[model samples]
Target: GSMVATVKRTIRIKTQQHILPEVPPVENFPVRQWSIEIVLLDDEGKEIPATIFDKVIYHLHPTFANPNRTFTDPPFRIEEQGWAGFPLDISVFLLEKAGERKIPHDLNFLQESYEVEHVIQIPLNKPLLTEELAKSGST
Candidate 1:
């Protein structure tokens, strides 16, 4: 029999004013801080385990700190201050997968919040890890 694993990925964008909480009043900062969040879930909207992902990479504008961000754990997200917005590149790698899936995002501050979604189809197969390992177990 053949099997497939279908998973859904989502990226949420949120923005807020970039202001300093100081006692004395000064020139208001005209900058805005934006936050990026990424998540992988099943059809039921349940979060997928971290073990299934080899790593997740995020490409941001060169002006931002750590333009190239890689996350190997859960709670994949980023927050930074910027006055302008641009396209964001994302790469998701799965365990034992041959290649990665590249996703593009047009980040903007036109709205208070926005979200983008994508679906990934992963092939699932049953194979023997090793003869010795399979020998101990019966099919």
Candidate 2:
């Protein structure tokens, strides 16, 4: 017997936290009042877990208090207070072996605005993770 080849090496999963042209009030700080999208593949992709290895840490700007905080969860996500919007840098701390976490991804996510549905797609892969940030980068 032999093997078969079909799927792409990388899978795209979109997880949303916030989007541009948005506005939220004083009562709405973060997370509590944001509309963002999260994705899982039905086909033409890889399983979500197959991509991530360990944990994901999100480092934020405009300091609410801290930056470079580590969060171990997924579908991992984030919400920024503003842009002059800052970059949501994600470091995936992984399982097997780790790859480079690319910053400057998913540019122009919003503050907190009059809302709508924003779908986000993230690319993930499983391989060679001596360590995995296991993450997302947005601005």
Candidate 3:
């Protein structure tokens, strides 16, 4: 018997920087947030089942010049940086269980799972801007 392994990659875009008044009220300070969806796709482009090694999710922070100062409100401006790649480090136990080896070849499938990472960029966008935002915000 032979085991085959493959790797696939994708880049998720983010929304533009929003500009707010220079001095916003305490309650109205901007909150920059974004979600990255990582999917494990088979050679045929279909999602599979997989399990992460240590944890279910990975948390990532962008490498900005000034993390705190970048995200403002309506008129804030920030430079774009390259994407940060982080693997979820999932472990696929192909032959761990006895029953797994007894299943039919066609029925026996590979693990396909994804780890999600969340990053906060400067000047967050309203949920509505997703359609118009660039696939890679500043990347």
RMSD of each: 7.7, 9.8, 19.7
Q: Whole-model lDDT for model 3 versus the true structure? A: 0.24
Model 2 scores a TM of: 0.44
Could you estimate the TM-score for every candidate? 0.63, 0.44, 0.22
Ranking by TM-score: 1, 2, 3
lDDT sort, best first:
1, 2, 3
Question: Please, what are the lDDT tens digits per residue for candidate 1 over residues 1-139?
Answer: 3323432333332333343344333344346667766655544555444344567888887887889889877546666666666888878776665347787878776777776666654433322222211222222
TM-score of 3: 0.22
lDDT of 3 by residue, 1-139 (tens): 1122211222121223223344343455432222322222333434332211111212223353433332212112223222232221211111122111111111001212233322222122322222212223221
lDDT of each: 0.56, 0.39, 0.24
**Per-residue lDDT for 13-62 in model 2, tens only?**
34334533355533354323222222233343333443342455665564
- Candidate 1 lDDT at 14 equals 30
How high is the lDDT of residue 134 in model 3?
27
Worst 10 residues of 2 by lDDT: 130-139
